[PDB]
Amino acid sequence: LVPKLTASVTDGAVGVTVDAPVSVTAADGVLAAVTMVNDNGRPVAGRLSPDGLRWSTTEQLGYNRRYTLNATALGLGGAATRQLTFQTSSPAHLTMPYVMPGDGEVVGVGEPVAIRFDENIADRGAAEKAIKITTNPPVEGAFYWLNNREVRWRPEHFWKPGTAVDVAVNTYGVDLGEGMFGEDNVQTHFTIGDEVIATADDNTKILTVRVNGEVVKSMPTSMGKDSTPTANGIYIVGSRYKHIIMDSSTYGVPVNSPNGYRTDVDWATQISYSGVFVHSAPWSVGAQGHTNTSHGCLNVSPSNAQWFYDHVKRGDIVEVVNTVGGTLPGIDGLGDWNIPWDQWRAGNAK
Numbered sequence: 001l002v003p004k005l006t007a008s009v010t011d012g013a014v015g016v017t018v019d020a021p022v023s024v025t026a027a028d029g030v031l032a033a034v035t036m037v038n039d040n041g042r043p044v045a046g047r048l049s050p051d052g053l054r055w056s057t058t059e060q061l062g063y064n065r066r067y068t069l070n071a072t073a074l075g076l077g078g079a080a081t082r083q084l085t086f087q088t089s090s091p092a093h094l095t096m097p098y099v100m101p102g103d104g105e106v107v108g109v110g111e112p113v114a115i116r117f118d119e120n121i122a123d124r125g126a127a128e129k130a131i132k133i134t135t136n137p138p139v140e141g142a143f144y145w146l147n148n149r150e151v152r153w154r155p156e157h158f159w160k161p162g163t164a165v166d167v168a169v170n171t172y173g174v175d176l177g178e179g180m181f182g183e184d185n186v187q188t189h190f191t192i193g194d195e196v197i198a199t200a201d202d203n204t205k206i207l208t209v210r211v212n213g214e215v216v217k218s219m220p221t222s223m224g225k226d227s228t229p230t231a232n233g234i235y236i237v238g239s240r241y242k243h244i245i246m247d248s249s250t251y252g253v254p255v256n257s258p259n260g261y262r263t264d265v266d267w268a269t270q271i272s273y274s275g276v277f278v279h280s281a282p283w284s285v286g287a288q289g290h291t292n293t294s295h296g297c298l299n300v301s302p303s304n305a306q307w308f309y310d311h312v313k314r315g316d317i318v319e320v321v322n323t324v325g326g327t328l329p330g331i332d333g334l335g336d337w338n339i340p341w342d343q344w345r346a347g348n349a350k
């Protein structure tokens with residue numbers, strides 16, 4: 001019997017995707033030599049199996065390449081040689097994904113998986129299928145898009161403390177629609193820490209911090225005045241700042257417009273993309289616990305703001321109740337939990 005050569009690609013092929021390695025296998029014989037070179041002649045890194053039956057590329061294959069594969073199989077029954085030339089995907093565009101939270105970070109029970117592309121994604125389903133989420137203990141979750149570039153993944157309920165979460169965004173070589181391909185793969189891993197939920201009740205004007213169910217802090221607060229109220233609902237804690245200049249035009253509002261502003265504040269914890277913060281407000285300490293005076297922020301004392309900075313982490317939860325405002329938008333950026341599970345689970349890939 002003459003040896004048989006079988007490659008993972010065909011000699012005519014074009015649009016060969018680079019999301020997977022190229023391989024060659026021998027039957028009724030072993031692989032004596034396999035080389036693969038690109039256009040100019042540079043050989044691709046590859047390794048042969050110990051039993052000599054299978055060879056495969058070991059480095060990343062490039063977009064817009066013309067590769068030529070040469071293989072020889074030897075067996076008792078004789079020899080066989082093949083030569084194959086193929087062309088890989090040529091993207092009209094590349095997009096790079098960015099993942100949050102950071103690798104190795106410990107976050108609160110409200111932290112969603114966040115994958116943000118630097119380009120609009122024409123084929124949302126293709127992107128979702130390219131993203132592998134591992135959870136331990138395993139929990140059901142689903143993808144939901146906040147906009148054309150950023151997709152979120154979360155369970156039905158807040159994470160259980162101690163849960164490991166692994167995120168592999170494998171979009172290299174993947175057609176993301178309209179000739180858009182992934183620029184590279186990214187992978188992050190994070191862990192869920194203590195359950196921290198802080199509740200702001202407009203009926204008491206108190207911000208109560210509960211850690212695993214126990215009250216550890218009760219902060220008098222001043223929230224949004226009736227003119228610019230604080231929206232009710234569930235807020236996810238984002239970034240924290242020892243100090244930050246608060247610019248209204250960052251959130252749409254022109255600085256010298258009626259409800260515009262530019263002020264420098266201390267100990268600020270962001271809880272919405274729309275610009276709601278927990279922060280130090282020495283000017284309204286008399287009002288805190290009594291009357292709402294803010295532009296929507298949860299004003300607290302300088303001491304309590306620093307405490308919040310020190311003790312609350314990314315992914316922890318702030319819940320606002322009983323204000324004269326509406327409900328925080330589900331697609332705010334930190335308002336994901338306000339979307340009903342039935343709607344989130346359904347997703348919006350189409």
Ligand SMILES: *C(=O)[C@@H]([C@@H]1N=C(C(=O)O)[C@H](Sc2c[nH]c3ccccc23)[C@@H]1C)[C@H](C)O
Pocket residue numbers: 246248261263275276277281283293294295296297298299
């Ligand atoms: C949140 O409300 C808002 C942020 N929080 C501030 C506040 O104190 O309400 C400022 S605006 C302000 C209103 N009265 C003041 C007196 C002295 C100094 C500043 C202010 C600022 C708008 C978010 C972050 O935009």
